[PDB]
């Protein structure tokens, strides 16, 4: 075994309810943007120092990339509409704190940068200090990832209005099937977004995968934009 995954790794074909042409008016091809896109995510984890703060701790790094590719739009040379680049640096601990049938398994604290690699005016980025907590119980997995925005957020000063201050993740193992829900919700502004997924093994390393996203903040360029996206494709690893 050579490389470690962090988040999920998948490639799906999607259709959004509405494409945010406004935010991307700067690109010449934007006026002819289509609603169907290839969406894919790559997510790797890189252990840098095992045992830094004990036998079950790790200084580590991760990198998650989400891309939206206008594949069918040959008229405009099938450009990428958006890519989000999400590198992290963290301290992780493998734990076994049991409470009410639930076992806390992962405690992770670190720094997160999330940006889209564009110049103005379509530049988007923010920095967060976060903690990720993962607990399981039977066929259930629950992950809470609260954060604190730090630094400059001039590209989208009101990003927390739409993203809130935490991300909740729920997994359910139904046989080899994995039902998943990933979401954010700011109570004070009413804005949020949810990602429901379903995956099933085709083989020991490949899974069929269907995803539905609804709400705000699917990508940085659509952080303040509401859409519903449905997609089908393949997956390497699901959450558990």
């Amino acid at each position: 075994f050579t490389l470690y995954p962090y988040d999920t790794n998948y490639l799906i074909y999607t259709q959004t309810s509405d494409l945010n042409k406004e935010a991307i008016a700067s690109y010449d091809w934007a006026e002819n943007a289509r609603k169907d896109e290839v969406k894919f995510q790559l997510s790797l984890a890189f252990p840098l120092w095992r045992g830094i703060l004990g036998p079950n701790s790790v200084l580590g790094a991760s990198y998650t990339q989400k891309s939206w590719w206008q594949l069918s739009n040959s008229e405009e040379s099938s450009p990428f509409r958006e890519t989000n680049y999400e590198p992290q640096l963290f301290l992780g601990f493998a734990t076994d704190y049991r409470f009410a049938g639930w076992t806390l398994r992962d405690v992770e604290m670190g720094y997160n940068h999330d940006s889209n690699g564009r110049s103005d005016p379509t530049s988007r980025s923010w920095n967060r200090l976060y903690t990720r907590l993962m607990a399981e119980n039977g066929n259930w997995l629950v992950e809470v990832k609260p954060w604190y925005v730090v630094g400059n957020t001039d590209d989208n000063p009101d990003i927390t209005k739409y993203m809130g201050y935490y991300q909740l993740k729920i997994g359910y193992h139904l046989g080899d099937a994995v039902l998943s829900a990933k979401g954010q919700y700011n109570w004070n502004t009413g804005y949020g977004g949810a990602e429901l997924g379903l995956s099933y093994p085709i083989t020991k390393h490949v899974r069929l995968y269907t995803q539905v996203y609804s709400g705000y903040g699917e990508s940085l360029i659509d952080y303040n934009f509401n859409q519903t996206r449905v997609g089908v494709g393949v997956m390497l690893n699901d959450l558990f």
Binding site: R50, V58, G60, F93, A94, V107, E136
Partner: peptide
């Protein structure tokens, strides 16, 4: 060992 644990996996080799 452990299903879903990113950290436990990273500790492995």
């Amino acid at each position: 060992a452990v299903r879903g644990s990113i950290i436990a996996n990273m500790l492995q080799e």
